[PDB]
């Protein structure tokens, strides 16, 4: 319950200025939060994907 | 009067005879259940030594089947 609360902590203040590049959204399933709620953390982001068909 | 001795040669293989070899087999029977048990001991955390054999022994069999809850796997 400390973890989570440490997340929204981190989320909130710490990540303007500070990666946590080692971490995965998977990595906090189980531990912090159920599947459906890290799937819902990462769905938000965009991420670069694979070039298209005109590269 | 005995003129001779009486016997026969019993067939036999690289020192080996029936009568011998007879009394080994429970033997080998017993080493061959300690391999077995040993050898599926050594495979019990494998995914399909669960799924195929172990869930199935009656009453005991429930030890191995466990299923991670859908909100706890990332996979
Ligand atoms: C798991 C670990 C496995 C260890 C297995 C050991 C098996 C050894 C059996 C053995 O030595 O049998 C001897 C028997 C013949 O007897 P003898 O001629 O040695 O008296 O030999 C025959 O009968 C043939």
Known sequence: ?55 | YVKKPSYKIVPHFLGFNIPTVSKWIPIFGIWGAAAGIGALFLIEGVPRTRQDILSKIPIIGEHWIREIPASDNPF
Not at chain 1, 6 to 14: A, D, H, L, P, T
Not at chain 1, 35 to 55: H, I, M, S, W
């Open chain 1, 1 to 55: 319950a400390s973890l989570r609360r440490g997340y929204q902590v981190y989320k909130e203040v710490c990540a303007a200025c500070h990666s946590l590049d080692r971490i995965a959204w998977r990595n906090l399933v189980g531990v912090t939060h159920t599947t459906d709620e890290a799937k819902a953390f990462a769905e938000e982001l965009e991420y670069d994907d694979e070039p298209d068909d005109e590269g």
